[PDB]
Amino acid sequence: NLENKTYVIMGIANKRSIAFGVAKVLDQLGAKLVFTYRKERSRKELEKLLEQLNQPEAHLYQIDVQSDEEVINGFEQIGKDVGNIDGVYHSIAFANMEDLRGRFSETSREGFLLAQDISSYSLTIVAHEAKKLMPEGGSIVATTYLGGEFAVQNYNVMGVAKASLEANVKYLALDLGPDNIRVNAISAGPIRTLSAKGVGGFNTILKEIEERAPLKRNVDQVEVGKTAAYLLSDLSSGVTGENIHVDSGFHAIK
Amino acid sequence: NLENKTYVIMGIANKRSIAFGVAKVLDQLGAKLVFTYRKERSRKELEKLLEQLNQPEAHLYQIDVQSDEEVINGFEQIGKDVGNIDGVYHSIAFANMEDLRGRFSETSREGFLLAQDISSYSLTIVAHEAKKLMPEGGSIVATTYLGGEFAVQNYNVMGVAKASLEANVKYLALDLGPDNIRVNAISAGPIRTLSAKGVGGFNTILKEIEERAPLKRNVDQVEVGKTAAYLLSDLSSGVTGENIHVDSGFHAIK
Amino acid sequence: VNLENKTYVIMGIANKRSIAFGVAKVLDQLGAKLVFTYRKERSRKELEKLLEQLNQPEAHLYQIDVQSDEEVINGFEQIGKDVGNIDGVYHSIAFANMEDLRGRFSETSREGFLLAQDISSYSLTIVAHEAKKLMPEGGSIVATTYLGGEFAVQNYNVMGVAKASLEANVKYLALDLGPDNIRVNAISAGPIRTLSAKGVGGFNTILKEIEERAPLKRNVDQVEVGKTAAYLLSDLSSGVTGENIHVDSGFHAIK
């Protein structure tokens, strides 16, 4: 029951974004929501998508995580429009496509530092800024993948980028824990999102999950969302620095 | 909302038990509850505590998990008496005092196997019999300690038993996954229960947690129960074979 | 590595395909004196025949059924009398009933479960307590594990719970015996066609998977375990305790 609660959701591109699953679940549970976006596709788009929700008013902010200025000013503006918040759902990453379908040993320095910047550092800077709006504490969640933990074929540079995120979570949880702010991750199983298009060896995973994972099925964005409701609410008080696998138990098998 | 849900809670001994933390939370949420005990002692207790709960009917069953008969015939009586359930909270462990204050290399064989019997194997037989009452699926949750992943001073044989329980949870997960039974653990941080009582200076991993955990506090039974409610309900739906730490972040640090 | 003037007790040779034998060949190649324990008479006969491949001028065989306190106690006492102090122990011993491996994991009998815990895990503890007595300046104790102790592996079942138990056992003994300069470590060998795999479903299909999916594209063998064991058992690993080395062509590190 999330009435009276306010969350910022970052990383909705369209109806298939993991973050849209998050949105729908907190909306249903009565949370006030705030959204951020990178460009103008996610802009008109988002507006249309929020007609699916039950938000009295549309708080959207253009934040590109590569600018410190846009993250600092963006969160400050959110503060001025909606007051204090109770949490942030981080759902932002990027790797160059070429770096995923070539050999990991061939990853450019640019492609590598690029994926670090967007997929991992974003969360540090966003967490420093969002902290200003959480005086009595709150909850930050980020979205990761098992490739951060073990080497998965063709995940490559994004795997290194998610290992970095998952350690980010750990260091943020210990830094902000005394300020009563919890920092956790959701390691989601593979889902058919926009970024999932044209990635090498992706749709073979969906299949292998079906055959091998304890639950013999794949997950969906609404499943990630539910666990997100958990991590973002007081139900998870006491739980921080953690990584919850919403993945049909694929993580627990070899 | 867990109305129209029924859960079996194993291992309330008194007001301070971890399992009563779980009970309160789930009762609050409208669930029906079924309780099991070992001792006569823990029964007159169970009856008393029920007065603090919204349970119009006391359903209590004596099950000593050392007995195959008592576990088969107990779950069979639950099922006649109440019907299908939605899952099971397993909060049962034991080790001889004598072995935990000795050096781990001095542990008696009988001590070691008995801790294994009650703390790990009991979940396996419990799962197999509880599955009988879960035709459409459900969720099984066991309680562990960080001493099962890493060597914790003085936890000794119980750590080994907890390691075996975490593995057991993984194998059960993969076995009972195609039956839509999810199996998970909560790794509780230290708590002042009737069990903590004996261990000397147990007060000092207690103090250590205050000083060093990210949240700089110790967790409570109700915080366990809140995470339990997540795992036992449809909220945790894509999560199985997982070990969630309700220990204020203690596991993410060194 | 130079193991001359060093002495090691090797537990769990049963035939020429035993992982403990790949261990024995290598330590022998490096100049170590070796002492052997066996359970079945059939294994003692094997050991006799097998020395003939080794350069062990004196043949030391001891019957130790690790189910028995008395047998472990007396066995290690007799070893002290007969050969004196030792530099480490290789433990290469496990058991699980075949009924429990063919059933679903949920169906495992209590008896099978506890027998698996007793022999595959508890025996490292008693072994370490009595071995320690022969190591007053310290030494190195090594056990063998398998990845199904860390992740649920299909068909490995009760044994997986057993290896999980052993792997914690290694950590608690490392912590307990550290102050006595005794290091305790495990090797997670990849799957190897021993006498003990022979019966087992799931085995032939994991082997193939390793070849196909593990970073090195091949399966490992008993000598490779042996080599890593010489590192663990020697001063080459003087800083290493409570550690689990996967000798498995990198299959642990992928998904």
Added chain:
Amino acid sequence: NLENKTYVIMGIANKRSIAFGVAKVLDQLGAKLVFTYRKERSRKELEKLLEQLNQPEAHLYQIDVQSDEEVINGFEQIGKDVGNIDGVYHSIAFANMEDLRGRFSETSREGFLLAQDISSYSLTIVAHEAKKLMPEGGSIVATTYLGGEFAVQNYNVMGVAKASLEANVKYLALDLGPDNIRVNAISAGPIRTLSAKGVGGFNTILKEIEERAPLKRNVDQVEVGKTAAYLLSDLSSGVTGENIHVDSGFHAIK
């Protein structure tokens, strides 16, 4: 016995370096060694460390790993001067102290990506260029710290770089496995080296080891070299993507 073997060693600063402990071990075992340095300071130092060693006409090379070209041309010059190698020991990382002095949440973007650059990607590019000189296969090892796996107090942005490194080592292992190149990490305990010199959190942990690690002592650079020699040799064939902890058992307790 690494007779007839050739190894490139990167990151000797002084006689207290970890990489020099490695060098002494490998030199004792009769291996050929190549050195790389950034600062001429470190060259001067190398030049005189050599008298301790039994190398005939030692080859020293400046490689600042922040530079693509110094690294390609560096290894290209090494294949020319001495031909094929059998291995690389990577002992290189950097983080600004002002990132480390502050709370982790205040970490500059710049300081994060530089850490990543120097401490993590430097491995990827090095691997790719050293592959060239290891046609029949070989062995690559790098140096991490337990702060890569867990949040260690004050380790801050380096913990995130080391996490990244650890992932890199795995993903290099899977891409490079088929070309018979093994890739591994050593997780060293704290040692008083040149780069330990300004750092907060160092005495704290160094003392906790003595009191808490199983061996109740801290480790030293030669103990690291011994494990380096194992992984860089045929003794560890079948071992890849692994992180060996040379830290008196500290990694294994909690």
